[PDB]
Amino acid sequence: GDDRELAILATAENLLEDRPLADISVDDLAKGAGISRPTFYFYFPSKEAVLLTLLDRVVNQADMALQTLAENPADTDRENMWRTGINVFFETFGSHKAVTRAGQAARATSVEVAELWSTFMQKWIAYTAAVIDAERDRGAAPRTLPAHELATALNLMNERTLFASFAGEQPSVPEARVLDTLVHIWVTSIYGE
Amino acid sequence: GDDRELAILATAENLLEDRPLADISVDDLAKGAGISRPTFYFYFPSKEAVLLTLLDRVVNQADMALQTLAENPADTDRENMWRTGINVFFETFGSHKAVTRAGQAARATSVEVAELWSTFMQKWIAYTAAVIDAERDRGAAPRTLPAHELATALNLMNERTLFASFAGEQPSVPEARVLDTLVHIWVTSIYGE
Ligand SMILES: CCCCNC(=O)N1CCC(C)CC1
Numbered sequence: 001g002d003d004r005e006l007a008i009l010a011t012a013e014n015l016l017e018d019r020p021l022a023d024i025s026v027d028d029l030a031k032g033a034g035i036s037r038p039t040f041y042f043y044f045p046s047k048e049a050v051l052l053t054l055l056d057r058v059v060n061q062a063d064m065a066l067q068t069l070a071e072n073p074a075d076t077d078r079e080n081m082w083r084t085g086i087n088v089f090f091e092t093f094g095s096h097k098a099v100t101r102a103g104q105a106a107r108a109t110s111v112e113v114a115e116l117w118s119t120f121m122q123k124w125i126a127y128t129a130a131v132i133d134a135e136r137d138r139g140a141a142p143r144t145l146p147a148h149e150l151a152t153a154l155n156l157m158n159e160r161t162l163f164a165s166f167a168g169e170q171p172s173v174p175e176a177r178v179l180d181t182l183v184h185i186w187v188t189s190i191y192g193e
Numbered sequence: 194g195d196d197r198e199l200a201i202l203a204t205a206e207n208l209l210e211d212r213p214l215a216d217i218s219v220d221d222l223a224k225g226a227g228i229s230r231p232t233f234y235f236y237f238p239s240k241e242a243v244l245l246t247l248l249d250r251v252v253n254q255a256d257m258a259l260q261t262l263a264e265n266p267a268d269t270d271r272e273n274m275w276r277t278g279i280n281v282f283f284e285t286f287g288s289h290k291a292v293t294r295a296g297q298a299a300r301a302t303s304v305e306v307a308e309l310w311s312t313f314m315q316k317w318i319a320y321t322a323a324v325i326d327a328e329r330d331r332g333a334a335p336r337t338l339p340a341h342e343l344a345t346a347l348n349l350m351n352e353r354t355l356f357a358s359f360a361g362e363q364p365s366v367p368e369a370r371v372l373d374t375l376v377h378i379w380v381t382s383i384y385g386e
């Protein structure tokens with residue numbers, strides 16, 4: 001069954017907790033999944049292609065949850081709306097730190113990964129700008145910055161800040177504090193004059 | 194004269210505009226500086242060590258300018274103070290995009306570079322938190338987030354946002370708009386309730 005593919009994906013994710021991809025081998029991957037090295041190469045052309053697929057799953061999972069969120073409005077409080085949105089990325093990527101970590105590094109080498117970050121970031125920034133615009137129309141938010149430019153910076157702040165937190169980088173916001181920090185900065189940049 | 198070292202530094206920076214370090218060679222570096230490959234190795238043990246030195250110069254230049262700024266206060270306007278601070282990093286790194294670009298990528302491989310970003314970021318975040326605290330004491334800023342946590346996120350936003358702008362990443366704030374965007378988000382997160 002294809003589900004050997006499922007087995008390669010789980011072997012990889014597991015191993016990426018312990019060491020970078022560079023220090024992970026196709027032997028290591030095939031072994032974990034309980035297939036031969038040549039049977040591995042039937043399912044994925046490279047180690048790098050396996051990362052890509054994982055990052056794709058994680059990214060689409062985040063996207064899907066944000067689509068679920070947008071199709072029903074949680075009963076009022078503007079701050080809570082934002083907190084609930086940003087939580088989608090905190091939880092989704094926070095459940096996949098290993099993948100999140102390797103994906104981000106791979107952006108410097110794998111334009112195929114870079115393109116995948118880029119696509120999904122553009123989409124999410126577009127969604128951010130539409131909510132700010134909608135909020136500006138209702139009269140709740142002042143027309144300050146260009147909405148899309150503001151949305152871009154805010155999304156970039158969240159990419160950088162969440163992943164530094166996840167990787168325990170120095171410096172970083174503690175993970176148990178990161179959510180409140182971003183929301184404060186989001187709400188206050190969106191609604192403030 | 195050592196100033197062969199100066200010549201290796203300028204050859205490298207020049208070339209890093211055209212191609213990544215990976216595609217740049219010690220031959221290329223020695224040639225540009227007008228020395229032999231073995232004379233090169235007297236001055237720097239690797240290509241990677243040359244990057245490091247450049248990033249060090251650029252980082253200290255930014256730091257020094259921020260020290261100049263702090264030792265005399267520009268006549269009032271809280272927003273302008275911040276704009277003037279952030280401008281230091283916009284101008285300094287914006288004059289060294291090639292170096293800025295290669296330094297950032299090298300963080301994923303060269304813990305010696307990672308450590309250099311880390312050190313200087315910690316310092317700048319500390320300075321940010323001290324200005325917010327000072328501002329909170331004068332009574333001008335509300336005691337909202339922990340000052341250091343806020344300073345960290347804001348600095349990370351600026352690292353991510355400025356370098357995406359510089360590299361023409363999609364997505365990004367246009368460079369001619371990036372300054373205003375960050376300041377708005379800075380001022381409004383610092384002074385807003
Ligand atoms: C509707 C609110 C969207 C919030 N966006 C958000 O949290 N992002 C921060 C995390 C990165 C990975 C994607 C963009």
Ligand SMILES: CCCCNC(=O)N1CCC(C)CC1
Binds near residue numbers: 320
């Ligand atoms: C006193 C204000 C400091 C502003 N900090 C700032 O603009 N930074 C953003 C750019 C990165 C490279 C370092 C931190």
